[PDB]
């Protein structure tokens, strides 16, 4: 449930914050954090290559286990569920009976105290990871590897999930969170369940300052600029676009598809996204 | 505790070890969900009125049982998880209603 505020300042009138209800441990695991090196949107040449970044809260990176096939057959206890600033999902602390500790992204319904496992024989239950080929068609699934042993790449965002639709040869067919229909190899791991924190999308930032805390610096309209700067720049008074709406670099930005044409994975995409 | 009659239809193109095996997952679960078995009736193959899983036949089990009321639902779910189990239907057991 998202948390509202009474309108005791102009901004609190709309601000909503997450409830943090699932959260049970308020400090990360010391040996599982490392500093996040903040970039500001600058590459190694020092140049802004992604605009409007910088200035957010300091963050420690929590190391996440996006492999999991790494420790087949060894079970673990879900020790805690925690906040992670580097992602929308919460993360779950796993105590393996081995004694190793790792983090995973926390699926909807993971209970602290429960046990999870990975491998071809794992029970089809929330929290477990198996190759896709051993997961019943119809099951909703998250953190999916896109190619075997390359790490979880799909459905990691708060609330997201993928569903297994069918099988074909060495591949299963997934419905991605976008609704794309795609073949993913049978040997790729996925974890049963959807990602938690599904209310994430209902948060209302509420004020300029909150975007600022997120490291998101103000974004300025091409329309508010000059011709040296942008296709929409200039004109006396306000102006309509005056040409097909364009990015600062001139490419058209309402409809122009941009996926590379001859791309090898086209062969594995069955149906481009919906809506 | 109440009496129910678990019906089950299994994959018909199984060899007898897989079938014995499926029966094993089944009987372990009946036990695990606190079901105590009473009768049991295994009429095996039998022709279906229509294809299930695109297949004119089905392998039929059946089990009058006594189990916790709260667990019948979760059991039916666990009974379905196998790709070879094609139907489950767990019915409250009841007296015959006779005609003639």
């Amino acid at each position: 449930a998202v948390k509202k505020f009474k309108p005791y300042t102009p901004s609190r009138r709309f601000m909503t914050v997450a409830d943090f209800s699932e959260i049970t441990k308020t400090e990360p695991e010391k040996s599982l954090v490392k500093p996040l090196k903040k970039t500001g949107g600058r590459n190694n040449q020092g140049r802004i290559t992604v605009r409007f970044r910088g200035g957010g809260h300091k963050r420690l990176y929590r190391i996440i286990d996006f492999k999991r096939w790494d420790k087949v057959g060894i079970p673990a206890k879900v020790a805690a569920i925690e906040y992670d600033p580097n992602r929308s999902a919460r993360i779950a602390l796993l105590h393996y009976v081995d004694g190793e500790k790792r983090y995973i992204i926390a699926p909807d319904g993971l209970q602290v105290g429960q046990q999870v496992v990975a491998g071809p024989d794992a029970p089809i239950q929330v929290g477990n990871a198996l190759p896709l080929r051993f997961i019943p068609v119809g099951t909703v699934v998250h953190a999916v590897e896109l190619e075997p042993k390359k790490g979880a790449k799909l459905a990691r965002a708060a609330g997201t999930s993928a569903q297994i639709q069918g099988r074909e040869g060495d591949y299963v067919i997934l419905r991605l969170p976008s609704g794309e229909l795609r073949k993913v190899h049978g040997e790729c791991y996925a974890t049963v369940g959807a990602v938690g924190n599904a209310d994430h999308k209902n948060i209302v930032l509420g004020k300029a300052g909150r975007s600022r805390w997120l490291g998101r610096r103000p974004h300025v309209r091409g329309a508010a600029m000059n011709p040296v700067d942008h296709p929409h720049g200039g004109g006396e008074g306000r102006a309509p676009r005056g040409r097909p709406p364009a990015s600062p670099w001139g490419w058209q930005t309402k409809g122009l598809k941009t996926r590379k044409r001859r791309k090898p994975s086209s062969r594995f995409i069955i149906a481009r996204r919906k809506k | 505790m109440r009496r129910y009659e678990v019906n089950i239809v299994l994959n018909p193109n199984l060899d007898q070890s897989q079938l014995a095996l499926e029966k094993e997952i089944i009987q372990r679960a009946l036990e695990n969900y606190g079901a105590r078995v009473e009768k049991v009736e295994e009429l095996g193959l039998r022709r279906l009125a229509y294809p299930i899983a695109k297949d004119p036949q089905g392998y039929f089990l059946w089990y009058q049982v006594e189990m916790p009321e709260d667990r019948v639902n979760d059991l039916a779910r666990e009974l379905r998880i196998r790709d070879n189990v094609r139907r489950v239907m767990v019915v409250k057991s009841q007296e015959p209603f006779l005609a003639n």
Binding site: - | V9, A49, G58, M89, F97, A99, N100
Partner: protein, 68 residues
């Protein structure tokens, strides 16, 4: 030619007894009216309920084409 007559004592709640049950279906597969089964109200309701369960199990059809 009422069906209830052309049978001996049978269980109306017995859904696995396809041999009895299948007689109450029209040749098109539909559950037969009271005027053809000779059932009363109370019994006919128990019939329809167990025929429906039976179709679920695979024992009875949901529909059958009409041959001439």
């Amino acid at each position: 030619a009422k069906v209830k007559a052309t049978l001996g004592e049978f269980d109306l709640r017995d859904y696995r007894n396809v041999e009895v049950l299948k007689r109450f279906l029209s040749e098109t597969g539909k559950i037969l009216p009271r005027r053809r089964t000779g059932l009363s109200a109370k019994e006919q309701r128990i019939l329809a309920k167990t025929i429906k369960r039976a179709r679920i199990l695979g024992l009875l059809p949901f529909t059958e084409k009409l041959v001439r």
